[PDB]
Amino acid sequence: GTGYDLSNSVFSPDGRNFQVEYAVKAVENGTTSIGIKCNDGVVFAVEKLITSKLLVPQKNVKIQVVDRHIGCVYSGLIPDGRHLVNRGREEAASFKKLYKTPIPIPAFADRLGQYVQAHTLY
Amino acid sequence: TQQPIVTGTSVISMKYDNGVIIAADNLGSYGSLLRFNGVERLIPVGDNTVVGISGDISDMQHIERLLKDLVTENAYDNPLADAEEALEPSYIFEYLATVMYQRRSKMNPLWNAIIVAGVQSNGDQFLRYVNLLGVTYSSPTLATGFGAHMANPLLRKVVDRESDIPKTTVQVAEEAIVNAMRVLYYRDARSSRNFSLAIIDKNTGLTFKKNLQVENMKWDFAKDIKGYGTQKI
C-alpha cells in the first residue's frame, strides 16, 4: 500500500524517510550559497535574489555567525535555517561555559547534526 | 547566602572634561593573606567602557564571562555591531545593575561593588556604580571600599560638582587618581602596590595602562619615631 509519506518518522518499504526527502526539495527550490575551504580558513557566499528595487540594498543579510569564529550559510526555508543557528549559538555557549575554549568545528557540526537528525525521529 | 572568599579591594574613578579614568590594584586577598598578585580587576568592554569590580573574585570572574557573552551575542545578526549598535556603557551598566538586584532579591548575591566607566556614542562621560544589593548611583567621582573613604575626599577636591568637570584635564585627573592610589597603599592593609589604570577619552578613545606602581613614597620620616610616648631612644 501507500501513505508512507504522510508522517515524518515512517520508514518506507525501501527504507527511506520520505518527509526528509520532500524537505530536500524545499531546499533545491532555493537560492545558492557555497563554501570554499582554503589554506587557513573558509569562505562563504550566497546568492541573494533581488525580488524588487523596493528592497533596501545590502540589508537583508543572510550569512550568520555562530559565536565569533563560525560562519553559517544555508539555502532553503530561511526560517528553518535561522532556527538551526539559534540552537547552534546555544550549543556553542553551553560548550564554552563548561570548557572555556570556543567550540571546535567538528564538535560544532556534530551538535548540529544531532539536532537535525533528531527531527527525523518523531 | 554566601560569604566572600578571595577578594579585591577599592576601585576608584572620576570623570573629567572629555572622558573618565578608573583604577584598581592587582591583588586578590584571602582574608589577611595577600594571596594573588596578578589580578586584573579592570574589565574593558569594547572600545568605550571599562568596568571595575571589587568584592569576591570568583563572582568577578563570573561577571567577566557574562560580559564577554554580552559582547558575543550583540554581534549576532547585528550588521552594526562594530558601530551604531555597539555596546554603550549605559547598556552594560543597566544590564549589570539588573543582575545584581535580581541576585540580591533571590538572596544569592554577587558579592561585588562595581563601577562602570565609559563614554557614550554622543560623547558624554558615563560613570556609575551598582553593588551586591542593587543600589546604584552616579557622581563626578566614585570609589568602592576604602576608596570611598579616602579617595573620594581627595578626588572631590578637584571635581566638587558637575561644573568642574569641563575645567579638569586628563593630566590633572590622572595625577589625582595616582595619588589616591598611593594613599590607599599607605592606609589600606589590603592594598597592593601594583595597579591598573584606564582612561576613556572622547578623542583618544580607550587607553588602558597595565603594571603601574605607587612611587614618590614618603617613609623617611619613620626614623625619628621611637617608643609610644615617654621613650627617649
Curated annotation (Swiss-Prot), chain A:
Record PTM: The alpha and beta forms are probably products of the same gene with different post-translational modifications.
Nuclease among keywords: no
Residue ranges the record marks as coiled coil: none
GO cellular component, one term: proteasome complex
Localization per Swiss-Prot or TrEMBL: Cytoplasm; Nucleus
One GO molecular-function entry: mRNA binding
Superkingdom of the organism of origin: Eukaryota
Keywords: Acetylation, Cytoplasm, Nucleus, Proteasome
One biological process term in Gene Ontology: proteasomal ubiquitin-independent protein catabolic process
Chief location of this protein within or outside the cell: cytoplasm
Family: Belongs to the peptidase T1A family.
Miscellaneous comment in the UniProt entry for this protein: Present with 12000 molecules/cell in log phase SD medium.
Subunit structure: The 26S proteasome consists of a 20S proteasome core and two 19S regulatory subunits. The 20S proteasome core is composed of 28 subunits that are arranged in four stacked rings, resulting in a barrel-shaped structure. The two end rings are each formed by seven alpha subunits, and the two central rings are each formed by seven beta subunits. The catalytic chamber with the active sites is on the inside of the barrel.
Its biological purpose: The proteasome degrades poly-ubiquitinated proteins in the cytoplasm and in the nucleus. It is essential for the regulated turnover of proteins and for the removal of misfolded proteins. The proteasome is a multicatalytic proteinase complex that is characterized by its ability to cleave peptides with Arg, Phe, Tyr, Leu, and Glu adjacent to the leaving group at neutral or slightly basic pH. It has an ATP-dependent proteolytic activity.
Identification of the protein by name: Probable proteasome subunit alpha type-7
Full protein stretch here: 5 to 126 of 288
Swiss-Prot record, chain B:
InterPro entries named in the record: Ntn_hydrolases_N (IPR029055), Proteasome_beta4 (IPR016295), Proteasome_bsu_CS (IPR016050), Proteasome_sua/b (IPR001353), Proteasome_suB-type (IPR023333)
PROSITE patterns attached to this UniProt entry: PROTEASOME_BETA_1, PROTEASOME_BETA_2
Gene Ontology cellular-component annotations: cytosol; nucleus; proteasome complex; proteasome core complex, beta-subunit complex; proteasome storage granule
Main localization, broad class: cytoplasm
Subunit: The 26S proteasome consists of a 20S proteasome core and two 19S regulatory subunits. The 20S proteasome core is composed of 28 subunits that are arranged in four stacked rings, resulting in a barrel-shaped structure. The two end rings are each formed by seven alpha subunits, and the two central rings are each formed by seven beta subunits. The catalytic chamber with the active sites is on the inside of the barrel. Interacts with CIC1.
One Pfam family from the record: Proteasome
Subcellular localization: Cytoplasm; Nucleus
Protein name: Proteasome subunit beta type-7
Keywords per UniProt: Cytoplasm, Nucleus, Proteasome
General function of this protein: Non-catalytic component of the proteasome which degrades poly-ubiquitinated proteins in the cytoplasm and in the nucleus. It is essential for the regulated turnover of proteins and for the removal of misfolded proteins. The proteasome is a multicatalytic proteinase complex that is characterized by its ability to cleave peptides with Arg, Phe, Tyr, Leu, and Glu adjacent to the leaving group at neutral or slightly basic pH. It has an ATP-dependent proteolytic activity. PRE3 and PRE4 are necessary for the peptidyl-glutamyl-peptide-hydrolyzing activity.
Family recorded in the similarity comment: Belongs to the peptidase T1B family.
Note in the entry: Present with 16900 molecules/cell in log phase SD medium.
Keyword set includes Membrane: no
Species annotation: Saccharomyces cerevisiae (strain ATCC 204508 / S288c)
